[PDB]
Structures are given as C-alpha cells and as structure tokens.
C-alpha cells in the first residue's frame, strides 16, 4: 500500500489537521499526478470556486480517464471541495487551510518547525554520513536477527509487542521467543525499504493503541522526509508522544542519537525515503551482490552475517560454511518446505535478483531462466489440489428449474461451480441455506 | 484439443 492509499482512507478531521502543516502540503503536492499538480498550481491563488464543466474542458477528450483519475484522487484526499456556486453551479475550491499552508511553504512566511539547532553550536560528538548509514544498517540487522530469534540480538520487549500486534511473530508460549509466522517470512523476504514501509504502515494502523497523535507523527515523518542527510535538528519543541516516537525511531536506526538526553538527532537516508514507501528511490546504492547462482542449482554467498545465511537456508540445503563463503544447493525439497512455510516463488526470485553478483550481471539475463522456470514449476506443484468445500445440487428434474435456481444463486453470489449440460451445480455452505430456502419456497408457490 | 492443450500447465499460468 502506497502513502496516498493510507492518506485517502483517513477521516476528514485528520486530513484537515494535517493540512495545518506546510510540509504535509508539500508532500501531498509532490505525491500528486502531474495533471493534479498543474490543477493545484492553477488554483493556488483562485479565491473563487471553479465550475466543474470549466475544469473538465481543460483536458483532452482522450485523457478524460486520466483527468477523472486525478479529479477522484483530489476529491478523496480532500485537497479541494465542492461548493454550491450561485445559480445552481457546483464550483470547485481548494481547502483554505491547505492552500494557506502551501502558500506559506512556497511563497514564504509562517514559522520554522525547527528552531535553528545551530544555537547549541557544533556537536562535540558529531558523526559522519557513512557512520550514520552503517548505524542505520546495524539497527535493522539487529531487528532482523531478533525476528530470527538469535540470542545475539536483544531488543526491548515493547518492540516485540509491536511484532506480536503486527502478527509477524506469535507468542504461542509465553516466556519463550515467539514463532514467526508465514507473514513474518514474507516480511523478511521483502526488500529493506519495503520492509520498513510495511512496518511503518502496521505501526500507523495501530498508532491509536499507544495513545500517540497520528497527525503529529505523520507531520514529523513528512518533515524528516525533506530533511538533509548528515544534518542534526532540534529535539526540543515536540510533545512527549513525539519524543517517544523519536526514541522508537532511534531504536529502529532511522534516527541517530548518542544519548536519550541529547538535543540533536540526525535523520538517515532510510527515513528520508521512508515516506516515499517503495518507489521514489530508484537509485538505491545497496550492498554489492554476493550471491552466485550456477546451472546446477548451487548458490555461493560471499557473506558472513548469520542473517543472510539463515535467509538462504530458509529455502536451500546448506552444504559448506567457509569463513568468507557459504555453499548451498537449491533443491525441490527445500523449495517445497519454504512454500509450505508460506514463501512464494516471486519473493525468492526477486530476492536472488537483488543479491545478484556483478559477474552474473554481465549476462543479459540476471538469473538463469531455466532455474527460475524450475522454481515456478515447483511452486505450481504445491497448489495442484484445489480444495473448495460446498454443497452439491444434482437432482434437477427440469432444465427450467435448474436455470432459475442458477440465476437466483448468481444473484446471491453464492455459486461455486455450474454444469448446465448435466444440470449440476455447487454452492457455498453459507449460501446453501438461502438457496435451500428459495428452492423450498418455489415448490410452496407451485 | 481442450483437454490436451490445457491440462496441467495452463489452469495456473493463464
């Protein structure tokens, strides 16, 4: 789910409160389509409502669908609103709060969100951008190792509580580490920006559980999105809920802070691209590919962290463990085990493509097509048996009665399968009672 | 031809 999908499902009050932040308006405008951006720029200084027909006459007839998509997106986000223009017209006018904040952000004025943290002078314990990036990587590595269950990763209990609420790991037996579910496996197989985006979406879905203001958190995230990497900002000026959220982000590695009492905080590139979700950051300079795939379904990994070793062992049989090399083999048994664990074929293929060694990048295909096809076939083998519980109707004496009952079932939407040639049909067990009652009532009316 | 052309590797691919 992208950012706008979550924003579009919010209540009008939350959207209005978020409109009071010029950074939020900037982010919303940046996330709009180009046609929507042009429409907003046209209406930036328009204090009068715009007739709908006049707005519609601007775009080409062929691009009406794209025009209608932009119009619907703008209406859903409540950026603009419809007003009963005098004479029966329905004018369109932007949100006054949103428009005012956008003008403040662009034209100037208002008040800065951060109170020029240079007041404290240079930081005695300032770090460097590579150090901040490495620390951000380390924290997420610790989180992933804890999700795996390795004792080397010890995190706060409430952090595990978030995962339990997220459903990735379920604490079937208290005291023992929770067992990570299939959803947790799918989360692990996602790319790191995707993992962060999904985790933040889950946090937002349960933001009210911690009593934290959604409007403040979203605005703070938007401000961090436009922040400069390697630059600190003022912790002061934020509510206690915001302070707790900032501490949580520091635990995630998105924000660097030497001490909990520190008044400075350095946003990281991960937090900058966090608002964009999965897109936007097309030029992500990730780690070089260390995985080499051979035609004999053999994987060679130039890695030493146990996280990647566990990820590879999730769907492959380990063979050798060298100090700087890990040799495993891709087998049908391991792939089927991963599928039974909930792992899909596409996740494995995408993960292997992400970890593609530069030597293999020289080939026109990123991965051997035969291996990918074999993996796809192994995945398709598991779901050969299709199980669908239902009630079978097969005693139709008249074709007209069978057609009428089939039409009624399709009206109810409880049809599972139909066979007009033999007058046989399958219905849902839940819808069986309704169809049975309808069939009995038809005989009663007869 | 319906049975042969689309028995195993079609009901999931298509």
């Amino acid at each position: 789910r992208n950012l706008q999908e979550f924003l579009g499902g919010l209540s009008p009050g939350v959207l209005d409160r978020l409109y009071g932040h010029p950074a939020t308006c900037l982010a919303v405008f940046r996330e709009l389509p180009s046609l929507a951006k042009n429409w907003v720029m046209r209406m930036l200084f328009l204090e009068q409502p715009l007739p709908q027909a006049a707005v519609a006459l601007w775009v080409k007839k062929e691009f009406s669908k794209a025009q209608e998509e932009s119009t619907g997106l703008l209406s859903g986000l409540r950026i603009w609103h419809t007003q009963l223009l005098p004479g029966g017209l329905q004018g369109l006018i932007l949100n006054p709060i949103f428009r005012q904040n956008l003008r403040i952000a662009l034209l100037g004025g208002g008040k800065a969100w951060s109170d020029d943290t240079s007041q404290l002078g240079p930081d005695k314990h300032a770090r460097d951008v590579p150090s901040l990036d490495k620390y951000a990587e380390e924290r997420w590595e610790v989180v992933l190792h804890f999700m795996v269950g390795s004792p080397s990763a010890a995190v706060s209990q409430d952090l595990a509580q978030l995962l339990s609420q997220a459903g990735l790991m379920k604490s079937t037996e208290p005291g023992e580490p929770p067992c990570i579910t299939s959803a947790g496996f799918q989360f692990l197989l996602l790319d790191t920006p995707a993992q962060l985006w999904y985790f933040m979406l889950q946090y937002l879905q349960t933001a009210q559980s911690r009593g934290m203001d959604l409007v403040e958190i979203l605005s703070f995230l938007f401000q961090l999105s436009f922040s400069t990497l390697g630059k600190d900002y003022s912790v002061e000026g934020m509510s206690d809920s915001l302070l707790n959220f900032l501490q949580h982000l520091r635990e995630f590695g998105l924000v660097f802070q030497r001490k909990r009492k520190s008044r400075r905080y350095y946003p990281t590139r991960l937090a900058i691209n966090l608002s964009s979700g999965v897109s936007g950051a097309g030029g992500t300079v990730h780690q070089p590919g260390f995985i080499v795939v051979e035609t004999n379904y053999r994987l060679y990994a130039y890695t030493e962290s146990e996280l990647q070793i566990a990820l590879i062992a999730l769907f492959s049989e380990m063979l050798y463990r060298f100090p700087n090399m890990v040799v495993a083999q891709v087998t049908r048994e391991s792939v089927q085990q991963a599928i039974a664990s909930g792992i899909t074929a596409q996740q494995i293929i995408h993960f292997l493509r992400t970890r593609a060694h530069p030597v293999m990048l020289k080939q026109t295909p990123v991965l051997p097509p035969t291996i990918t096809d074999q993996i796809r076939l192994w995945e398709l083998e598991r779901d050969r048996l299709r199980f669908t519980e239902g009630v079978l109707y097969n005693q139709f004496l008249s074709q007209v009665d069978f057609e009428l009952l089939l039409a009624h079932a399709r009206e109810l939407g409880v049809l599972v399968f139909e066979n007009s040639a033999k007058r046989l049909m399958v219905v849902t067990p839940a819808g069986h009672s309704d169809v049975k009652r309808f069939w009995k009532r038809q005989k009663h009316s007869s | 031809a319906r049975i042969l052309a689309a028995s195993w590797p079609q009901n999931r691919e298509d």
């Binding site: 080499v292 051979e294 035609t295 004999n296 053999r298 060679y300 070793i309 062992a313 049989e317 380990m318 063979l319 050798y320 463990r321 060298f322 100090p323 700087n324 090399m325 890990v326 040799v327 495993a328 030597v359 293999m360 051997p368 097509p369 035969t370 096809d373 074999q374 076939l377 | 031809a1 049975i3 042969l4 052309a5 028995s7 195993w8 590797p9 079609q10």
Partner: protein
C-alpha cells in the same frame, strides 16, 4: 563439525588470509576444491587443478574439483613433488591449507613410484629399489598366490620375481590394499626387443592445443605411460590415438566395440598414419587378414574374449598375438571394460603400454575403482564448455519437452505396476504429435533429424506412422549403409529412426537435430555419449550459441521424469543447460496426427494389443 543447517563448519580449520581477490581457490579440508572462473588467474588455476585434481563439476562460474589418490599418483608421474604443489596451493587458496589435507598429500606422494612392473620376454617382473617393502609384501597370502612359482611349487627366487599372468589383475587390487601401487613405466626410447615401424604422421594431421597438452602430459619425461584420456565425441579422438601410435613407433593393438569401429580406426590410420596397408590387418569374423607382418592389429574385445570355441584360423591368430609382444595397446570405449569378460581380455593380451579412450567414465554400476588399476589414472579430460567457446565443437541447444499423458493412458499407467508400463508412456499420442510437429518444423528448416528410441516396438511404430527409415536389431548391414547414404546425400529424407544400436554399434552421421523419445532406464552416461556422438560442429552457425539442437521428450507425471532427471545430472555437471518446454508454439496452426480423441483411442487399443511380450 556440522551446523544445524547441514553446512560443514570448516571455518576453524581454514585460516582465511587477507588475499581474497587475488587468490581464486577455496580448499576445504574434505578434499574438495572450488575455483572461480572470473578470476584473472583462472587459466593458471585451471591448469594447476587439471594436473593434480579430478574435476567434479564445471558450470559457468564456480568449478568443483576433487582430490584423489589416483590423481596424486598421476601428478607424481607428471613430475611434480609435494613441495611445489603445496606452494602453488597456498599461493592460490583463499584460506590456509588444513593440515589434514597436507598429511593426506604427504602420505600418498612418498609411497608413489616405489614398485615397478616390467614386461620382458613375455614375463612379468616386480622389482623395486627398496627390498624391505618387497620382503614385507611377500608375507601377504594373496601376493604369495599371485607370485609365480616353480613346477614343483617352490617360489621363484633391485631383485625381481616372475608373477603369474592370470593373477596380474589380482595383484593390481592387492597393491591398493598394501598401499604400494604399481608403476606403468615403459622404455619409450630404450626399447630394443620390439623394432620400430615405418609409420609417421602425415602433414594433414594437426594437433589441437588441448590434444597436444594431453599427449605431452601422457608422455611423462618422454616415456609413454599407461592411462586414460577423456575427450568429447567428434574432437578427433581417433586422430589423437593415431598420433600416439605413430609417436610410439612400436607394435600397436586397437580394440573397438564392433566391426564399424574397426573400419573407422583403419580409415583414420590410413588417413593420418604412414604405415603401409600390408602392415594393417583386421582380425574380424568376416574380413580376415593374415597376422604375419601385422604391425598394427585392430580387433574387438568380444573377438579376443570369445570363451566359446573359435575358428581354426582365429585360433592361430590368437596364438600369434599371445606370442607377439606388443609395445602399445589401444582400447576404445573404456566404460564397457569393467565387464568381467572384457577385463579378462587384459589378462589374455600381453602389452607393455595400454591407453584407453572414451567419452564418459561414470558407469551406472560404478565399477571404476578397479578400472583405475586395469589401465591407469585418468590422464586428461577436456572441458566441454571451453571447447564450445573455442569453436571446436557445436554449442548444443538442449531442451526437455514435457508431453502430457492422456487420461486414458494415465489411468492404465497407474494401474500397471510391472515392466509392461514402459509401453504406455513411450507411446503417448501427445508425445507422438509433439515429435511430428518437431519433425515438420525441422524439415521446413532443412535440418538433419535423428530420432532415438530404445524400445523396438515404439520406434518401429513411430517410424512406420511417420513414414521414415527405421534402424533396429537386425538391420542388415547393406540396407543400413544404404539408409545412411540416403540420409547423408538425399535431401528428401532427413529423418532417421535409430534404436539402441545407435550408441556404438555403427558410425553416426553428422546431424543437427537429435530427439530422444525412449530411455534405457537411467543410463546417465550412455545417452550422454550418444548425444555427443550424434551432434558435431556445423559451419555457418559458429557465431550463434545454439547451432546444434537436442530435444528430450519426457512424459509428465511418469517415471520417465525421474529417469531424465537422473540422466541429465552428468550433463549438468558439465555446465549444459536444460530448458523445460511444456507448450510448443505452432502446434495449434499445424495439422498433426491423432487430432481427434478417437484416433488416440485407436492408438491406445494398438498399444494394449502389444502385451508385455513386446
């Protein structure tokens, strides 16, 4: 130590040094060696590994080699000591060499080259420079029986002693038990009993660099050494054998599977060697030549291994062969040697230098450990992918086509549990339609088509319905040759159906499309050798990476899937790819047989009529 994931924890035993990128080799303490092909020192590392390590797998990027005692003995026979090999390994291994492998190398190399076996005056002598080892080995009861004794039963007295010829192969295995392997050293230049022969190399013969390297490795210090060289089919293996025979200049013996192999070897000798035709004789059952003045003799293993009474002239020829001392012996298709009857031929024939040539050595019965002493260690084995890159051989386009089984056949397939089940999946109407469409496509593309089917009934039925020549058991040789000539010359006929006899019973004409329908049951090496022999390099499509086409029709959800998977393991170890094709594009437009389901019902009736007898 084993991790919970099954990976062998070799981190502790392998001390990694900072020279990661420069050194391309990984040396695990289990004896396996891993090499990266993209490394700049790949060529030097490849040459070093080939000399000392027997390859296991050679895919595109990372190659896996194995260290064996026979490989160490071959390396010692080349002329490499322990010190230089250890230095080169440490210069190329990413991690430090474990002491377990080090001690393994130290023990084997010291024990090599101690015991020598000499064949002089039609007598076998075992001698060594260390009489203590000889005295110690006398206590062995097996060695006591193998040692030749006097007519009164008294044992015969660098001191050498005669050894019974019938117990020579027994002594070879006992050397492994005593950890003192024999030495197959021949006086290449010091020979005087056997005179030279007026045979040389024609200027038309050119030795490819890998062929020359293999020959030079075989000729250790200028002396011919017994061993086995593995080369792909069509890479001039017969030319290499002829060159070796010319270099030896002594009496030469060549053995083939059938008379066709004998004729091919004789033609190659006439094509490349300068030996007169009067000195070339064929000891065959039909075309016989006088053994007098036979400088080079070409025969077959079964002719020399005929336990039953032979013809009077053949008996005289065998007596002359036994009396005659042969400096050099040549054996073709070593993979059939592990058979007991063919192994007895080695005991029967007295030869000084024995060289074996074949395409594969992975016997399904894994009777190769004894073969390592029947002839010797594997001297050389060329990389198939590397030779494809060099253009010496065609870059074959391999594909496995999955033919869905008809529901009528499938139910009967599951119902049948005996060996009669082969006919059901080997006669799939859908497979028939796929083969027909492929044949039509390749005929429209003007390609040579060879359809291989082990089952006689299935092959005959397919050839008859498709109206193509069929080759099977009897296949009268005149008609067989006529069919071969028609396939080579007549453009109207470009599709030949060949039974199991197409492996080695005759010569396979050069083609480009090979379709395998029926399987032996898991012949991972036989069909691989057949595929190598069928397809050769074709001019015109050298630039393209797909110049030779091989298709394997496999019935879905059947035991043929397992057979194909087991068989293609050898080719995958060679880096050959295999693409699975479930849907064939163009079958919908093209009209094929059994379009209606009732025709498939008729085919099912015909197949069921063919009972378990067929």
């Amino acid at each position: 130590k084993v991790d919970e994931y099954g990976a062998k924890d070799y981190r502790l035993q392998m001390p990694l040094k900072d020279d990661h990128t420069s050194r391309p080799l990984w040396v695990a303490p289990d004896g396996h060696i891993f090499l990266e092909a993209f490394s700049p020192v790949y060529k030097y590392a490849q040459d070093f590994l080939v000399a000392i390590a027997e390859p296991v797998c050679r895919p595109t990027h990372v190659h896996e080699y194995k260290l064996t005692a026979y490989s160490l003995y071959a390396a010692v026979s080349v002329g490499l000591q322990t010190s230089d090999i250890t230095e080169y390994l440490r210069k190329l291994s990413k991690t430090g060499v474990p002491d377990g492998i080090m001690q393994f190398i130290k023990l084997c190399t010291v024990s090599y080259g101690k015991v020598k076996l000499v064949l002089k005056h039609n007598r076998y002598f075992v001698e060594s420079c260390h009489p203590d080892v000889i005295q110690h080995l006398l206590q062995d009861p097996v060695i006591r029986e193998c040692r030749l004794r006097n007519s009164e039963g008294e044992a015969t007295e660098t001191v050498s002693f005669e050894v019974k010829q019938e117990m020579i192969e027994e002594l070879q295995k006992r050397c492994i038990h005593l950890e003192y392997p024999l030495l197959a050293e021949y006086d290449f230049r010091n020979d005087s009993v056997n005179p030279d022969i007026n045979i040389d190399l024609k200027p038309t013969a050119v030795l490819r660099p890998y062929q020359e390297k293999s020959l030079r490795k075989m000729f250790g210090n200028g002396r011919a050494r017994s061993g086995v060289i593995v080369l792909p089919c069509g890479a001039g293996k017969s030319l290499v054998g002829v060159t070796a025979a010319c270099t030896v200049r002594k009496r030469c013996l060549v053995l083939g599977n059938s008379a066709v192999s004998v004729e091919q070897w004789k033609a190659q000798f006439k094509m490349w060697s300068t030996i007169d035709d009067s000195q070339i004789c064929r000891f065959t059952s039909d075309a016989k030549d006088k053994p007098i003045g036979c400088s080079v003799a070409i025969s077959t293993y079964s002719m020399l291994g005929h336990t039953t009474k032979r013809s009077w002239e053949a008996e005289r020829v065998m007596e002359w062969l036994k009396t005659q001392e042969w400096g050099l012996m040549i054996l073709d298709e070593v993979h059939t040697i592990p058979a007991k009857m063919f192994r007895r031929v080695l005991t029967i024939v007295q030869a000084h230098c024995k060289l074996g040539l074949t395409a594969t050595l992975v016997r399904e019965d894994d009777k190769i450990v004894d073969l390592n002493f029947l002839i010797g260690p594997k001297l050389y084995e060329a990389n198939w992918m590397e030779l494809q890159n060099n253009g010496y051989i065609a870059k074959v386009q391999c594909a496995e086509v999955w033919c869905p089984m008809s529901p009528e056949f499938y139910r009967e397939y599951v119902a049948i549990k005996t060996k009669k089940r082969i006919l059901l999946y080997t006669m799939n109407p859908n497979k028939f339609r796929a083969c027909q469409f492929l044949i039509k496509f390749h005929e429209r593309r003007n390609d040579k088509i060879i359809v291989f089917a082990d089952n006689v009934f299935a092959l005959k039925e397919y050839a008859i319905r498709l109206n193509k020549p069929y080759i099977y058991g009897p296949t009268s040789q005149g008609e067989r040759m006529q069919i071969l000539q028609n396939f080579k010359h007549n453009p109207k006929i470009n599709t030949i159906f060949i039974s199991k006899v197409g492996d080695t019973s005759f010569d396979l004409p050069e083609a480009n499309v090979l379709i395998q329908i029926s399987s032996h049951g898991g012949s991972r090496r036989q069909e691989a050798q057949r595929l190598g022999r069928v397809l050769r390099a074709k001019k015109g499509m050298v630039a393209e990476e797909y110049n030779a086409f091989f298709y394997s029709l496999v019935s879905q959800d059947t035991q043929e899937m397992a057979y194909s998977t087991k068989r293609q393991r050898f080719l995958v170890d060679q880096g050959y790819s295999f693409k699975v094709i479930t849907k064939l594009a163009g079958m919908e437009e093209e009209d094929l047989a059994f379009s209606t389901k009732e025709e498939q019902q008729q085919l099912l009736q015909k197949v069921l009529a063919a009972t378990d007898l067929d």
